[PDB]
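Notebook entry, cofactor series.
This is the third protein in the set we're modelling with a bound small molecule. For this one the ligand is zinc ion. I'm keeping the input format identical across the series so the outputs can be compared line by line later. Sequence and SMILES below, as received.
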Amino acid sequence: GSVVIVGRIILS
Amino acid sequence: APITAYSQQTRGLLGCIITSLTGRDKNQVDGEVQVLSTATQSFLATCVNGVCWTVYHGAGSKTLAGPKGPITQMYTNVDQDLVGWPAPPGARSMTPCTCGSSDLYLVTRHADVIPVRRRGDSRGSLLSPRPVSYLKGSSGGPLLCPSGHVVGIFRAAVCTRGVAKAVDFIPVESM
Ligand SMILES: [Zn+2]
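Returned structure with ligand:
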């Protein structure tokens, strides 16, 4: 059972 | 604050359960912090120097769904509560702090940027305390110095009576 990237945070 | 952040979601349930099962993620990967889920939990990874770093109480020893099928940890350190996968292409890799600053900024899963006072190697106090449910899902998230470099990743809230007053973190020296 693999961990999944469900979204991301863009840094500023 | 001095840093800003925003989220963008990339999948929801059906895509989640299907990708954990299959281990293949064709999505384009972007950004400095990956939002992660498994079956039971939700947490963060911070890309530092080409490694996506997160907390071992969240990822266990799992692979990370990738472009070419599932990606193996290259770093797994249970006592430190740290794990590391080679970051997928697309990730925005950040850089280790050296300014030694004690004004830190926690980035949460919701992309809030909240001020923290460095207190020890691996402890930082919330300048204004928050409900612990507001930090939930944010483990693996970055603690930033004021020029935007990694001092560490968020491990656990220290909380009395549902309000979070301090935070344990894995100091980037560990990474
Ligand atoms: Zn710094």
